[PDB]
Amino acid sequence: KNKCVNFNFNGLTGTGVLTESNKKFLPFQQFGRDIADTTDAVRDPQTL
Amino acid sequence: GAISSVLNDILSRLDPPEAEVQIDRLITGRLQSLQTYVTQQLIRAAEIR
Amino acid sequence: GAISSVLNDILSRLDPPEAEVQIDRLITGRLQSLQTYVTQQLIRAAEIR
Amino acid sequence: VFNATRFASVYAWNRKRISNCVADYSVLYNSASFSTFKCYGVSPTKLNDLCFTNVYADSFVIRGDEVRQIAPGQTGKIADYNYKLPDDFTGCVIAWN
Amino acid sequence: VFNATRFASVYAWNRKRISNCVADYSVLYNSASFSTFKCYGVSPTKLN
Ligand SMILES: *[C@@H]1O[C@H](CO)[C@@H](O)[C@H](O)[C@H]1NC(C)=O
Ligand SMILES: *[C@@H]1O[C@H](CO)[C@@H](O)[C@H](O)[C@H]1NC(C)=O
Numbered sequence: 001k002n003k004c005v006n007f008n009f010n011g012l013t014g015t016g017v018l019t020e021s022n023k024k025f026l027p028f029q030q031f032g033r034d035i036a037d038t039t040d041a042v043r044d045p046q047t048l
Numbered sequence: 049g050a051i052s053s054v055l056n057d058i059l060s061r062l063d064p065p066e067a068e069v070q071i072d073r074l075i076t077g078r079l080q081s082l083q084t085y086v087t088q089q090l091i092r093a094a095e096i097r
Numbered sequence: 098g099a100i101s102s103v104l105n106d107i108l109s110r111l112d113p114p115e116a117e118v119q120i121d122r123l124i125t126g127r128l129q130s131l132q133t134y135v136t137q138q139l140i141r142a143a144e145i146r
Numbered sequence: 147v148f149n150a151t152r153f154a155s156v157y158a159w160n161r162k163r164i165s166n167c168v169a170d171y172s173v174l175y176n177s178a179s180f181s182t183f184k185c186y187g188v189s190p191t192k193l194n195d196l197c198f199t200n201v202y203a204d205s206f207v208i209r210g211d212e213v214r215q216i217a218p219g220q221t222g223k224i225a226d227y228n229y230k231l232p233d234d235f236t237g238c239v240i241a242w243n
Numbered sequence: 244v245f246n247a248t249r250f251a252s253v254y255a256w257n258r259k260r261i262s263n264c265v266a267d268y269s270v271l272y273n274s275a276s277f278s279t280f281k282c283y284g285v286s287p288t289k290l291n
Contacts (some may be wrong), residue, residue, distance in 0.1 A: 011197045013056040037053070049121050051187075051236070060196040061188040061236075076125075084132060091139045095146075110285040112219040114233040211278050221287045222280075223272055 010045045049073045098122045147203045148240070156229055157208035164201035170194065180242045182213060187236025204229075213237070213241050245276070268291065 006015040012031060021041050025032070032040040050070040052058055058067050058074075099122040101107060107116045107123075147162050154160040169191040174180060183190065203233065208216065208224055215222035218235045244259050257291040268290040271277065280287065 008196075010201070013060050015056075015194070049117075060192060063189045066146055066189070080128070080132065083179075088139070091136075091143060094143055104290060112233070112286050115286070116218045214279070223275060226272065226288060 002024075009042045012039060012042060014039055049077070098126070153168060153205040153207055156208050156224060159204055159206045159229060162203050162205065164203060169197070169201065180240055182241035184238065185238035186218065188238070190238070210237065213239075245271075 001018050001020065001045075003017070004017050007013075007018070010030070021034070023041065025043065030043040032038040032042070050058065050073045051061070053074070055071065056075070058070050061067075062070060099107065099119040100110070102123065104120065104123070107119045110116075111119060147164070171190070174183065185193075187191060188196070206229065212222055214220075216225060216231070217239065218231050218233050231237075244261070268287075271280070282290070
């Protein structure tokens with residue numbers, strides 16, 4: 001966390017700094033998107 | 049016109065020779081997206097000036 | 098660059114996946130024509146303003 | 147799915163769901179089986195790097211000369227009538243003798 | 244045209260002019276004849 005990494009999370013390839021988000025996702029909600037529609041946040045498939 | 053907007057998605061799906069065809073569509077569209085912005089900004093700057 | 102400039106001609110000849118390739122040639126040329134028009138109109142209006 | 151003894155006919159085709167498992171497609175190239183393998187939508191080599199959510203393999207049997215007429219947008223006595231593929235469909239073509 | 248007994252050689256090829264008639268191309272899909280059938284210029288199903 002808190003470091004720039006090139007990551008692939010549940011078949012989603014991206015590069016960014018991973019930080020713990022205070023937003024509350026619904027159980028089905030996984031991949032979040034910003035105004036630009038680029039991925040804002042994801043959910044760890046191993047330990048949710 | 050490309051399959052997907054994400055570059056990391058196209059690079060993860062199509063062949064390197066195949067991805068260059070669809071990436072060519074995004075860049076050309078993003079150039080026109082940037083050219084349209086710069087063109088307006090150059091024109092809006094003349095309005096501000 | 099398309100086989101014809103009529104949409105009804107391309108849709109009635111090539112496949113729907115094949116027509117999108119030729120329709121991409123029309124719209125790209127029609128966007129560049131419309132963006133150039135809007136570019137001039139913004140510049141011509143600056144002369145009028 | 148691939149190695150099954152007798153597939154369902156192309157007239158009535160069985161839909162085999164693939165979910166909650168680990169799909170390694172390098173096994174296809176490890177031992178020689180499939181004669182004709184081509185992926186229109188993705189890369190055969192990147193199938194292991196990037197993975198897919200819901201995999202549905204439709205098995206059937208068709209005449210040999212129609213392997214070239216089965217593809218998105220292609221036509222034929224099968225594609226136009228019995229079993230058709232979407233024009234925007236992304237997938238792979240798997241065939242063997 | 245299609246089911247003619249003997250075509251001309253490719254050296255001197257026959258030019259068959261088809262006009263003033265009704266062409267139903269669904270017959271080609273009715274009985275299997277052509278081994279390789281593809282249309283580069285237009286769609287084969289849109290021929291009718
Ligand atoms: C495995 O996955 C499950 C469910 O996502 C998770 O609860 C568990 O912590 C993961 N790790 C192990 C070793 O089970
Ligand atoms: C199918 O399974 C049999 C029995 O395990 C094996 O002998 C054969 O090599 C397999 N063939 C293919 C195409 O995987």
